[PDB]
From a paper:
We first describe KSI, an enzyme suggested to provide electrostatic complementarity to the transition state via oxyanion hole hydrogen bonds. Phenolates, analogs of the transition state and reaction intermediate, bind and accept two hydrogen bonds in an active site oxyanion hole.
Results with several spectroscopic techniques confirmed that the anionic phenolate form of the ligand, with a negatively charged oxygen, was bound rather than the unionized phenol form. The ability of KSI to bind phenolate ions in a mode analogous to its reaction intermediate and transition states provided an exceptional opportunity to isolate the electrostatic behavior of the KSI oxyanion hole and thereby evaluate the energetic contribution from electrostatic transition state complementarity. a, observed with enzymes from two different sources and by two independent binding assays, suggests that electrostatic complementarity in the oxyanion hole provides at most a modest catalytic contribution of ˜300-fold. The results herein indicate that hydrogen bonding in the active site of KSI provides little electrostatic advantage compared with water. In summary, electrostatic and geometrical complementarity may each play modest roles in catalysis by KSI, and there may be additional contributions from better accommodation of the steroid ring geometry in the transition state than in the ground state.
Numbering used by the authors:
A (entry chain B), B (entry chain A): 2 to 61, 65 to 127
Write the structure that this text describes.
Amino acid sequence: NLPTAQEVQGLMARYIELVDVGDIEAIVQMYADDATVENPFGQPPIHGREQIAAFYRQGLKVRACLTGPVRASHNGCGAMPFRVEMVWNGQPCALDVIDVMRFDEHGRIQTMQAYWSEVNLSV
Amino acid sequence: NLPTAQEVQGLMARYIELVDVGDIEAIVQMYADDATVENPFGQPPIHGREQIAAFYRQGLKVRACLTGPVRASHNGCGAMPFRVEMVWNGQPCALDVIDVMRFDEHGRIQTMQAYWSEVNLSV
């Protein structure tokens, strides 16, 4: 059901583990079927698992690690800071991001907002 | 005006500096006159500078430190992770928090959501 705060901490940590290994189908399964993603926040959202899978397939050697604890609420939401390390035109880079997620009553991500901009990239 | 991503980084960093010294009047001035604060996110919002002042006066020796970079967007919003250290019944404790802010056209905080729960407290 709709995650408690402990359950949100666990779900968001699992998300980062899935991004880190790059398991696109497992990441997509964490989302509700009609979830929305705004990544970076400020951009038009993407809707549904097909579009979300496309987004992660395009983005995802990548590593992702939490860079602080998950902050969870008592209403099925949480926020976390992390860093993604990737290769862009042969150049290692890193991006610092904070995601905010809202989970539904089945423990699936209903909405995701990713906060970052070019200021958060390190080449 | 409405802050660029660089300006959001600067404003949110300034907010932490003001919380760290405990300058309640300077903090309240960062908010729009009719701003809303949800802290912790999940609790009913408070509205307006008078209630926001009361909130900070009650919450605020306290220290506050960013524990990673500000993540700013291009639509006048940002998110940041930080830690607040305080004394509760003579016991030092720390709270890990992520705040999301939305700034208005004058560079004032229109809405603040603070993410954390008891899971983020260390006594």
